[PDB]
Design a protein around this ligand. Structure first.
Ligand SMILES: Cc1ncc(COP(=O)(O)O)c(CN[C@H](CNc2ccccc2O)C(=O)O)c1O
Ligand SMILES: Cc1ncc(COP(=O)(O)O)c(CN[C@H](CNc2ccccc2O)C(=O)O)c1O
Ligand SMILES: O=C(NCCOP(=O)(O)O)c1ccc(OC(F)(F)F)cc1
Ligand SMILES: O=C(NCCOP(=O)(O)O)c1ccc(OC(F)(F)F)cc1
Ligand code: NA
Ligand code: NA
Ligand code: NA
Ligand code: NA
Ligand code: NA
Ligand code: NA
Lengths: 395, 268, 395, 268
């Protein structure tokens, strides 16, 4: 029994060991109670505004669209305290944790942005934070490891499996199954068992809400499309949510194509995997023919995850949202182009969305289109990784 | 079949509890796994719980994770596990055999087809670790249609609704979970909660076996004194496999000695 | 002849070689023209809001003031695009550069925040940017070197003298004296020859303007004091300016004490140097008895400068503002305390201001005081420097 | 005194321009500097421009920066420079001696006291590199009170107001700046702007010497043909000091040869 629907069509549910069901039901109940609690809403709103810096800017590109009929705005989640959208829902979940009397936080992280958000929230709100991070990601997103430890969080490297995001996810869930009485699992994307996909959407939807208000004010109309990258699905559903009922607005999610879909080294389960059960949910998974979970790959740690949130799987199935993929190299080009021509250093994750927007424009340069890309993070964590790659090329 | 009912009927006549070892199928390889299983049976195992290696075992601690990794290193697949299960049943016609599955391996190419496959090879039960009763409907329905017992966890944090549902839905035995967390021999489970044992019996549930962190004969005898029908040990046994990888002969002797002592503790 | 007063009491002026006077007069004239130009004001305002993310938050500390009668707010310039207050006036000066038809930008940098701001502004507005940075600073503020180069700016390491800020200043000025026909010198602090101290103040004053509006809204009164660090003087005068006529509000500037004033290894000319002529201005200078410029020292590259802007020297002389110093170790403590207890990673420069605020509170914990610290930057550029220090200690 | 007037009176009688070398005082050390200066004079220098090492020479390129660094490495201070200036004047009573100062060294412990000090040792002029005419008042006033000529730059971007002010304020000679930038021998200055030369003469300014990037006899003769009263060379001479640091004897011979050729080019 639940208070809210755990499914989005066929997708979602609560596929966890029985031991964890009361924790999930408790969390669902606290979320439902908090949503109608004016005190909670005011506290959340105050943290978003005065601590995290909402509303974030909506920036019109001045240069990169020159000579085309594309108008492109960037929703500036890179300006949020912490440096990515991940901070929004962490603040909300942290308040839920305290509401349920939990004193500890467990979180997985890959880009380290969710880990930084969890650490900073735990420092402010008096929680003891431990973060699981794939050892590969500890290296390629090292600046965030330093930030997390500086804020007093315990960062635990995970060497098992691919030593990336799904392996951190596995460890976080194993830990929580033993510590749920005192620890809240601050899941960092819109995936996992219910009620996480719902809570994460609801604590990110201010992205799309602001975007709509902003684009209305500046352009007098809705966008032709909003474009976001998709690793687990939080920044995308946060952008998409307030536009779902505006049928004229394209909802475009961008999965990482890695070295190319044909190489099998990608992170695009929604369009190139098949439905399966793992990490507490029924959702598209990269999986072998006999049902073992495949390892994903992406240049960006934040997209290096072989499944995807169930609401995206649903929106795709009914054709309300469209999903595409963008490769490492395409993402790198978009990264460079934004740095050099708009003076913004985007996260490599966000660069996948920008890259797809630049394709839409370049492929059809006389097509009138008003586009918003969710610029989900800043690229500070990525500058050394990108430098080494660009240098190893000869640039 | 009623391999579980026949077993519990017999154990009750001898006034003893069941001892049920768990191992991962194909750990450390197919041939040695098959020998390990024969040794578990020869040493007094009343039934078997057998794991199919899965890529991402979220309910398992390091010991059983490493068992899965050894089986994969040997190329073990679910198809090969079903090949072993046929050889096991062929040698041991009466022993109850339960599989411990992760959901994706059951759902993968058809839930019904998975349970049909179990019935065909002569498996008696399936416990799907990451399918709570809340999500269990097509699993338990498929299980019953193919004469497989669906086995459910009764966790220590169980309420009355869950007690009634586990009692109604489950067959074969009720898995009485000793503690929170994931599998592991060093994290010792608590004693069986008396209130759960009594309620399971009041509601005509399948007999309760205690599992998780059961690693010593004393825990087995204590589970039975507490009212459980028996106990399951996994990690403690797998550690003996891991310790003796270099010596299959010494592996078998130690397995035999341990299972024997564990089984003896189940006796009145 | 000038349009505006180049002096603040005894301090300021235009002590440059005669060759550079027309450039300064041109710049003064363009500034005066721009200030009354609605088009310019609207363009500047739009960049500040929609590109840089103004207004920035004013955050009330939740934890670090516990058990005292101090209420402490942080003006969140760390949330400005680029990561520090330096972005504000760079945007304004970049528009001036284009107004005067310059196609190139020269800038010095020390923390690399001014260099990052100049690079990002030049990328957006189509300017060719070259940055001089002391070689010591290239190492201890390396993340910003990567960011600057990623945005297409040329970063030139300066090995002469102390290989820090004043040596970059020297090189920038030498370069400009030969390239002023095509290059604008985007000076990065409120110092140097007139009209820089005035322009920099006027293009930073939104910091204090917002702060006053914000503190009025939240507290119904003005602060007892506003506290800012002082390396050259831009973030401080930007905070101070709108409060200068509110006589009840203390204006407190914090110079770096380095290893301690008594060691002579500091950067506190205002209170520990003496008036001299260098870098185009008459201002307090760290200098030898016979008038050679001394090298400064601070753990923070952004404060490692042996002079200070003339308006601060003036405000101090008439007693309108008070200036203090804070050592490396005190700054490090404040850095750590903000990370662990408010979940904000501050620049080491800004940490000097926070440290002084924490002293005001701790020294007199039952004194009722409402304080604002200008949190001039985020500490990303500093995390590796701080880690190495903290590790070398045994923490 | 009127050492400059006497010099220009004499040069005019011989229908020649002035050649005026610059060196940094105390580069590469006090004794060798004093010898370099004697060699410059013996080789035909009409006057001297002498730099006092300053910590942060913002008008100077690498050549003269390195001269300052060599002088500092030898422990040279302004006090020691004034000691050398006394020895120079003692040996050479008639040659005009101009100092090239950065403002802080003049302002440091009293502008008046600095110029009094210059008068006392027998210096004839002071050019303060970073004091434009706009800031010059207490400098030029102190200079005149102590019979020192304040020398000002007439830059190539000069307007009529600046021409009038330089003509009115300056004494001794007018420094006609050949180009933008900082000092350096390889960045060659342009020819003297004819319009500035004519205007300076119309306004009764002190005679114009061209300076910055003058590094070859051809440039000297061209400055004089252009109407200038002469030329100043600095970096080109300092490079000869830098090149021959290991051989003071060869340093002196090369200095002599170069100054001689430079001075010869000033002759009609
Ligand atoms: C700037 C930015 N933009 C986009 C993304 C993509 O994440 P999303 O699709 O939720 O919007 C990330 C993901 N970041 C990771 C992965 N976080 C993560 C990803 C998948 C599963 C679990 C996770 O914690 C993290 O910070 O832990 C990001 O940092
Ligand atoms: C976050 C932050 N907070 C405070 C400061 C102190 O600078 P300020 O006193 O202007 O407010 C800096 C100075 N940053 C240097 C030095 N910029 C600099 C300093 C002195 C002289 C010239 C300079 O370009 C730079 O970015 O180049 C900073 O990054
Ligand atoms: O029997 C199992 N493992 C072997 C015995 O445990 P241990 O002795 O600790 O290795 C076992 C493992 C997981 C499981 O599903 C769930 F996680 F939900 F409980 C059920 C039984
Ligand atoms: O005479 C000077 N240097 C030596 C001659 O130049 P160079 O031959 O290029 O070394 C010299 C250097 C600086 C100066 O002040 C100002 F910068 F304002 F012009 C005046 C004269
Ligand atoms: Na994914
Ligand atoms: Na997403
Ligand atoms: Na499947
Ligand atoms: Na300073
Ligand atoms: Na300041
Ligand atoms: Na002085």
């Amino acid at each position: 029994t639940t208070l809210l629907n755990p499914y989005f069509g066929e997708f979602g549910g609560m596929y966890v060991p029985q031991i964890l069901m009361p924790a999930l039901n408790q969390l669902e109940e606290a979320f439902v109670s908090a949503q109608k609690d004016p005190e909670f809403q005011a506290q959340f709103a105050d943290l978003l505004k005065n601590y995290a810096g909402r509303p974030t800017a909506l920036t019109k590109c001045q240069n990169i669209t020159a000579g085309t009929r594309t108008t492109l705005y960037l929703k500036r989640e890179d300006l949020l305290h912490g440096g990515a959208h991940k901070t929004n829902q962490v603040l909300g979940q942290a308040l839920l944790a305290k509401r349920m009397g939990k004193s500890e936080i467990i979180a997985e992280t890959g880009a380290g942005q969710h880990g930084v958000a969890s650490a900073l929230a735990s420092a402010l709100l008096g929680l003891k934070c431990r973060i699981y991070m794939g050892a590969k990601d500890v290296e390629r997103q090292s600046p965030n490891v330093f930030r997390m430890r500086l804020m007093g969080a315990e960062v635990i490297p995970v060497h098992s499996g691919s030593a990336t995001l799904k392996d951190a996810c596995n460890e976080a869930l194993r830990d929580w199954s033993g510590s749920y009485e005192t620890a809240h699992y601050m899941l960092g994307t819109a995936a996992g068992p219910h009620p996480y996909p719902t809570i994460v959407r609801e604590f990110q939807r201010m992205i799309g809400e602001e975007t709509k208000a902003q684009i209305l004010d500046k352009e007098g109309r809705l966008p032709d499309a909003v474009i976001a990258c998709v690793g687990g699905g939080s920044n995308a559903i946060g952008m998409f949510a307030d536009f779902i009922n505006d049928t004229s607005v394209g909802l475009i999610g961008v999965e990482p194509g890695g070295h190319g879909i044909e190489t099998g080294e990608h992170g695009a389960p929604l369009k190139h995997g098949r439905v399966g059960i793992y990490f507490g949910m029924k959702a598209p998974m990269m999986q072998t023919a006999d049902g073992q979970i495949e390892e994903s790959y992406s240049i960006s740690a934040g997209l290096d995850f072989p499944s995807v949130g169930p609401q995206h799987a649903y929106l795709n199935s009914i054709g309300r949202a469209d999903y595409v993929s963008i490769t490492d190299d395409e993402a790198l080009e978009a990264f460079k182009t934004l740095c050099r021509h708009e003076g913004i250093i985007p996260a490599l994750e966000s660069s996948h969305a920008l890259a797809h927007a630049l394709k839409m424009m370049r492929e059809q340069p006389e097509k009138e289109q008003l586009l918003v890309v969710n610029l989900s993070g800043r690229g500070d964590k990525d500058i050394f990784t990108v430098h080494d790659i660009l240098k190893a090329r000869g640039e | 079949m009623e391999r579980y009912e026949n077993l519990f009927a017999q154990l009750n006549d001898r006034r003893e509890g069941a001892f049920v070892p768990f191992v991962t199928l194909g750990d450390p390889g197919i041939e040695q796994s098959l020998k390990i299983i024969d040794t578990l049976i020869d040493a007094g195992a009343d039934a078997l719980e057998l794991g199919v290696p899965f890529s991402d075992p979220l309910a398992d601690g390091p010991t059983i994770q490493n068992a899965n990794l050894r089986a994969f290193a040997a190329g073990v697949t679910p198809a090969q596990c079903f090949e072993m299960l046929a050889l096991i049943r062929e040698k041991h016609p009466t022993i109850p055999i339960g599989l411990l599955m992760y959901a994706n391996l059951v759902f993968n190419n058809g839930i019904d087809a998975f349970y049909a496959r179990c019935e065909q090879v002569g498996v008696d039960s399936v416990l799907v670790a990451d399918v709570p009763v809340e999500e269990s409907a097509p699993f338990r329905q498929a299980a019953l249609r193919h004469n497989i017992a669906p086995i459910f966890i009764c966790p220590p944090n169980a309420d009355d609704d869950l007690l009634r549902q586990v009692a109604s839905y489950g067959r074969g035995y009720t898995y009485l979970l000793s503690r929170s967390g994931v599998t592991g021999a060093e994290n010792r489970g608590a004693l069986p909660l008396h209130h759960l044992i009594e309620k399971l019996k009041e509601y005509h549930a399948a007999p309760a076996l205690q599992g998780f962190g059961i690693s010593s004969p004393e825990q087995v005898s204590a589970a039975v004194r507490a009212g459980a029908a028996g106990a399951i040990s996994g990690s403690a046994i797998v550690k003996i496999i891991e310790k003796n990888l270099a010596s299959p002969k010494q592996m078998l002797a130690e397995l035999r000695s341990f299972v024997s002592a564990m089984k003896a503790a189940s006796r009145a």
